[PDB]
Design a protein around this ligand. Structure first.
Ligand SMILES: [Mg+2]
Ligand SMILES: [Mg+2]
Ligand SMILES: [Mg+2]
Ligand SMILES: [Mg+2]
Ligand SMILES: [Mg+2]
Ligand SMILES: [Mg+2]
Ligand SMILES: [Mg+2]
Ligand SMILES: [Mg+2]
Ligand SMILES: [Mg+2]
Ligand SMILES: [Mg+2]
Ligand SMILES: [Mg+2]
Ligand SMILES: [Mg+2]
Ligand SMILES: [Mg+2]
Ligand SMILES: [Mg+2]
Ligand SMILES: [Mg+2]
Ligand SMILES: [Mg+2]
Ligand SMILES: [Mg+2]
Ligand SMILES: [Mg+2]
Ligand SMILES: [Mg+2]
Ligand SMILES: [Mg+2]
Ligand SMILES: [Mg+2]
Ligand SMILES: [Mg+2]
Ligand SMILES: [Mg+2]
Ligand SMILES: [Mg+2]
Ligand SMILES: [Mg+2]
Ligand SMILES: [Mg+2]
Ligand SMILES: [Mg+2]
Ligand SMILES: [Mg+2]
Ligand SMILES: [Mg+2]
Ligand SMILES: [Mg+2]
Ligand SMILES: [Mg+2]
Ligand SMILES: [Mg+2]
Ligand SMILES: [Mg+2]
Ligand SMILES: [Mg+2]
Ligand SMILES: [Mg+2]
Ligand SMILES: [Mg+2]
Ligand SMILES: [Mg+2]
Ligand SMILES: [Mg+2]
Ligand SMILES: [Mg+2]
Ligand SMILES: [Mg+2]
Ligand SMILES: [Mg+2]
Ligand SMILES: [Mg+2]
Ligand SMILES: [Mg+2]
Ligand SMILES: [Mg+2]
Ligand SMILES: [Mg+2]
Ligand SMILES: [Mg+2]
Ligand SMILES: [Mg+2]
Ligand SMILES: [Mg+2]
Ligand SMILES: [Mg+2]
Ligand SMILES: [Mg+2]
Ligand SMILES: [Mg+2]
Ligand SMILES: [Mg+2]
Ligand SMILES: [Mg+2]
Ligand SMILES: [Mg+2]
Ligand SMILES: [Mg+2]
Ligand SMILES: [Mg+2]
Ligand SMILES: [Mg+2]
Ligand SMILES: [Mg+2]
Ligand SMILES: [Mg+2]
Ligand SMILES: [Mg+2]
Ligand SMILES: [Mg+2]
Length: 111
RNA sequence: GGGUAGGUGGUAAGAACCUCAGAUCCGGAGAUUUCCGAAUGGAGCAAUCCGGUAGUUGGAAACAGCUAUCAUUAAUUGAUGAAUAAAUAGUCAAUUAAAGCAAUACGUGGUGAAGUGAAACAUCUCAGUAGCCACAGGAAAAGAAAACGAAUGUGAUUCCGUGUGUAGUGGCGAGCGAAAGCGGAACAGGCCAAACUUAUCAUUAGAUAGGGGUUGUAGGGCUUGCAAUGUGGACUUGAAAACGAUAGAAGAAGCUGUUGGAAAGCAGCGCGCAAAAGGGUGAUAGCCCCGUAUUUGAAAUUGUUUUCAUACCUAGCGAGAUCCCUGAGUAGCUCGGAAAACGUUAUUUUGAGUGAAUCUGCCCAGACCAUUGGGUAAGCCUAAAUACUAAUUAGUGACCGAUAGCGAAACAGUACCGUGAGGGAAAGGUGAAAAGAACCCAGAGAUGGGAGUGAAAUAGAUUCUGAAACCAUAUGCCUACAACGUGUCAGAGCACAUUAAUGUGUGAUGGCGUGCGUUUUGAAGUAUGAGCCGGCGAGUUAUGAUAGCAAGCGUUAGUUAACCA
RNA sequence: UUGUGGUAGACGAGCGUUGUAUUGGAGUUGAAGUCAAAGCGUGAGCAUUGGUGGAUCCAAUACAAGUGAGAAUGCCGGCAUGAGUAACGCUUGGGAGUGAGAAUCUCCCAAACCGAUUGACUAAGGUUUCCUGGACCAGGGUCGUCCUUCCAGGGUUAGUCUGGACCUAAGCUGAGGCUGAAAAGCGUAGGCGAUGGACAACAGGUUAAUAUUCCUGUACUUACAGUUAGACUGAUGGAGUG
RNA sequence: AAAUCCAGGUACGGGUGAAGACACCCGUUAGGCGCAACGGGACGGAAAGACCCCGUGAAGCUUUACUGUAGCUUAAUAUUG
């Protein structure tokens, strides 16, 4: 399975942004990146191009989007625990459904 | 089958979809596989053209779709059948194999030079090398003594060390160079012909299909008995098990502060280890991530080994007879060549000719004869150790790091050159992240100057660092009566202030002064080589000999080579 | 105390580069590289500081070398000198327009050369160079708003034309077969092979680009089937013509 | 653009010198730098002299040079009575 999936809450443990909590919107496995909303906001200088029906307007000024972040800098956020902390996860397989599930190793919380 | 939550191959954003009834992706097994190409229906200027036959569907037929088949050679079988009665030649049909390619590499065989060395050259060497051709194989070749060879001897072949640069062979010159023996790697021996016998062929068999036999301290057959039902194979089918190969699963351990754009660096306090190999993460991470040690797992295909059964092959010691068999245009011999270390010679081989004997036999022990001894030619097959790497997996390097390393880090045998065979380059790096510069000004625009992002824009796509030759700008000094290898020793004036040093920059003027390498008796040279700058560019390696120096071991010393772990 | 010129040459002692092995050390508070400066050594050489640079490097003792560049009419790359020099490879003037910019582009009027040709149709070859619009990185021996250059789109219509589905010449290939150490060479029957033979379409119009091909008009030729009438049909071979 | 180019700030007379000097010795002359000319010199440039000699170099050709050989011719022998 994968450490980070599309949807789970995640934070950053290194870089300029420390303790930045967000939701992963999309995961690129090949480049080992991850787009997390609200973090790594870059502002491309949007030019103007008019060669299509939609390009006839293409209103783009100082649009702030999302920059991808290396998957190593991401860490899963705990929610079930009363005192939330950042830890590592296991890949135990519960015989109830025989499906692999991530479980933290500093607690007993699933996913 | 594995495995998930993403995917629609790269320069690549966007549009539109797919995907949790399990996608994309990885592995095993299959399906489809246009045309040329061995190309094989016929042709042909390769990727084109023109068909025949037998079916089936439309048409009223020509015709047009949709299928299968149609080359040559060799072997077997059957039919037909000339000159010419029979019979062959030939013709036709059916079945089974062969064609070709590549691994710039190993094997075998045929053919086979020259440059060169001998300080010339012809014998010789180079060299049975290059090249040309044929046939393979996963290896090939060789192979079970008519042997070595001098002994109370060894007992297929192959490969390694030594014997040794020894015996020898050489216009006895240049050179060439074994076979024994010894030490090792591996080890395996089997099977036909003939006798004799069985059955069948107008049985003129001298032929076909079986039993019997495979030799040297001779064997086998003929007749007559005892003991045997086993052990082992280079061996067929099956069944079972184990070890693997082709995807994978799990897989421990860290926070705080400081410089910094960013920590993983540094410091403090800890923790894990059968994991401190490696890669990435904004610098240099055992504990951030992927992994690694370790424990594991295969539906399907495939490899090795073992066990059981089952085919096939596989068996001893006597007696008598005195009879038969033991590989012929063969061994020898003569005339020309060759192979072996040998430049032809005892041994091996053959183009021409001739030509034997049959265990009281034949061959051999470097001419030859006799004695002694060794071995059984003229028939076949044979695993292992041995040779090599185009390719698949893992990994290593006192190997290279864009003039190096493969010619080719990029889309390189490309661009390009030549009718053709053939010849054959150069070229890598933005930033952590494109956040790739919106906007303003000048300009026709590219572009430039600001702004903005960024730690850095003198990192801006001309994109890591940026040397010299070369071209321009400028502070300071000097230079327009001056004979100059352009420098050196003295020396005013001018202008500054340093790796603080009897300082530095320029140099009115005085004295002296014909470059650097090469090759020469002798070069400023009217001898030669270099336009300048930068990179590259020429005493090595392997095997032996001698001598110097040093160390280890020593007076029945010293030291191993191959090979094994 | 005696000495210390020196080529060929002999001998001895050292420096420097890259990497490896052992120790220690420095580095985003800035390493290598790289530039400058008024330093230290007997020599190869070695430091200090500052600028640039952005991640490795240094000292000691040993070991191994693709280990030292000024010359080879040396190889490769760059840049000078000659020198803004020779040369720019046969064809004039003006008006109007476009354009930011015009001797060179567009149009018009002349002018000058070709006129058995610089005119027109095609074979061979070339392979999109053809037409339209746009552009002025590069190429054009100047310039360029323009080009046979570049970009985007488009363009080649056959029963009668040129060649196959027809035929042969030189020649090539060639089952069998002959010859030859091998590869192969020769060659019969067959099969290819035009530059030749046989075979039915002419006139005009149309698009920016095609036209005996598209369109209009008028024709012709060869096959197959049905039908009417007549006739016995007569080749893979013989003969004539070709 | 081009061949060329050791660095140049590149006079003349007599002498000297590797024997014919822009550079040496002794004298004479000459302000700095171009442009257009013409070729005296720079033993000018282009071509590692083709002439000559040397090399125990190469190649072509010749012959009663040497050693061989294709082909031609003669004999023995086998096919061969
Ligand atoms: Mg599946
Ligand atoms: Mg010779
Ligand atoms: Mg010689
Ligand atoms: Mg010689
Ligand atoms: Mg064999
Ligand atoms: Mg895993
Ligand atoms: Mg882990
Ligand atoms: Mg690490
Ligand atoms: Mg003999
Ligand atoms: Mg020999
Ligand atoms: Mg005997
Ligand atoms: Mg003897
Ligand atoms: Mg015998
Ligand atoms: Mg290269
Ligand atoms: Mg380069
Ligand atoms: Mg070509
Ligand atoms: Mg800028
Ligand atoms: Mg540049
Ligand atoms: Mg740069
Ligand atoms: Mg003066
Ligand atoms: Mg005067
Ligand atoms: Mg003077
Ligand atoms: Mg003077
Ligand atoms: Mg002076
Ligand atoms: Mg002087
Ligand atoms: Mg020198
Ligand atoms: Mg001389
Ligand atoms: Mg001389
Ligand atoms: Mg001179
Ligand atoms: Mg000369
Ligand atoms: Mg010379
Ligand atoms: Mg020169
Ligand atoms: Mg140089
Ligand atoms: Mg010694
Ligand atoms: Mg001396
Ligand atoms: Mg070192
Ligand atoms: Mg520095
Ligand atoms: Mg070198
Ligand atoms: Mg030049
Ligand atoms: Mg110039
Ligand atoms: Mg001139
Ligand atoms: Mg002139
Ligand atoms: Mg001129
Ligand atoms: Mg002209
Ligand atoms: Mg003119
Ligand atoms: Mg005229
Ligand atoms: Mg014309
Ligand atoms: Mg073109
Ligand atoms: Mg045009
Ligand atoms: Mg145009
Ligand atoms: Mg131009
Ligand atoms: Mg028509
Ligand atoms: Mg034809
Ligand atoms: Mg014709
Ligand atoms: Mg036309
Ligand atoms: Mg030039
Ligand atoms: Mg004199
Ligand atoms: Mg000469
Ligand atoms: Mg000679
Ligand atoms: Mg010679
Ligand atoms: Mg004769």
């Amino acid at each position: 399975m994968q450490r980070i999936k599309k949807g789970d809450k995640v934070v950053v443990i290194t870089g300029k942004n420390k303790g930045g909590s967000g939701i992963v919107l999309k995961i690129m496995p090949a480049r080992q990146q991850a787009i997390v909303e609200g973090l790594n906001k870059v502002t491309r200088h949007k030019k103007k191009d008019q060669t299509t029906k939609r390009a006839a307007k293409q209103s783009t000024g100082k649009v702030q989007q999302e920059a991808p972040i290396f998957l190593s800098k991401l860490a899963l956020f705990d929610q079930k625990a009363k005192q939330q902390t950042i830890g590592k996860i296991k890949y135990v397989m519960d015989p109830k459904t025989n499906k692999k599930t991530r479980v933290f190793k500093k607690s007993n919380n699933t996913l």
